[PDB]
Amino acid sequence: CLIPSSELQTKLDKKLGAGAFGTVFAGIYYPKRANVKIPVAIKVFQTDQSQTDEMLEEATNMFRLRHDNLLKIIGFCMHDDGLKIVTIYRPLGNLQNFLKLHKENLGAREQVLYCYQIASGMQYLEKQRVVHRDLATRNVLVKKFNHVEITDFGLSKILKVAIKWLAIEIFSKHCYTHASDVWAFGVTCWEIITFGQSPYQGMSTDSIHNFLKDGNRLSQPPNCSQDLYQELLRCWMADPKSRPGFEILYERFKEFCKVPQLFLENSNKISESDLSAEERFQTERIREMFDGNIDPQMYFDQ
């Protein structure tokens, strides 16, 4: 539920990243009932001392969101400085840096699986009437080669370069809906297909608005099939109502996972030596981030 200071340690020297609206630090979680150490990531939001009943209401609502493809929120704590959101630390990093690093060895099965698992988590969020508002590969974490998790969800009432994932209607009026998440999901899939290159690379803001207003979309990658590109295209409809829901998108990509090399050209497939090398890289990142304080199995046993 609510974590006190006696159970949390914020490593202010282990800054994980910048953030649109809040920095993230590595940390260790000490459950008082159990001498077990849990490597965690601590996101710090300092928002005008807004320690109100509304912030507690949306902290527990976000805490009850449970799904295998959602990053588990271990707990929360509200301070005078602001709000800290604690999540389980993932040594592999976000999907954006993960796609670039493993561009040459990730297979077509892994790419369709990421789109499927992300669509699986978004379906749970949609059924919970929760708008993510910031869906992208940078906000998707990699647990292992065949398992990704969505993070930074449910920050609507809690409160940039994300224009590349912004639907057309958001430019005119601010109305973050589930249909706008479907748009960002289409761009998110495009990142996975292109192994994490930047959308609208030869462009800039706000020319993207008129580029999308003139009916243009992101070009089909050379490795993307036509049946898969039509899915991204229908994620980018002009009318917000004409776009499919994550209920439809979940059933589509699940059928795509049956034969993944039928929708993406990828000569590479994951090797069992890379599975063992991935396990060695996770223990290394755990040993370095916490200076041997965290036993690597403690994270694996979790």
Ligand SMILES: Nc1ncnc2c1ncn2[C@@H]1O[C@H](COP(=O)(O)OP(=O)(O)NP(=O)(O)O)[C@@H](O)[C@H]1O
């Ligand atoms: N639970 C976690 N485990 C491991 N790394 C994490 C975790 N949460 C966040 N990170 C990393 O910490 C960084 C902080 O990201 P974040 O502060 O959310 O901003 P962002 O994802 O870059 N974009 P934005 O949130 O819109 O400002 C990210 O680059 C992640 O790679």
Ligand SMILES: [Mg+2]
């Ligand atoms: Mg983020």
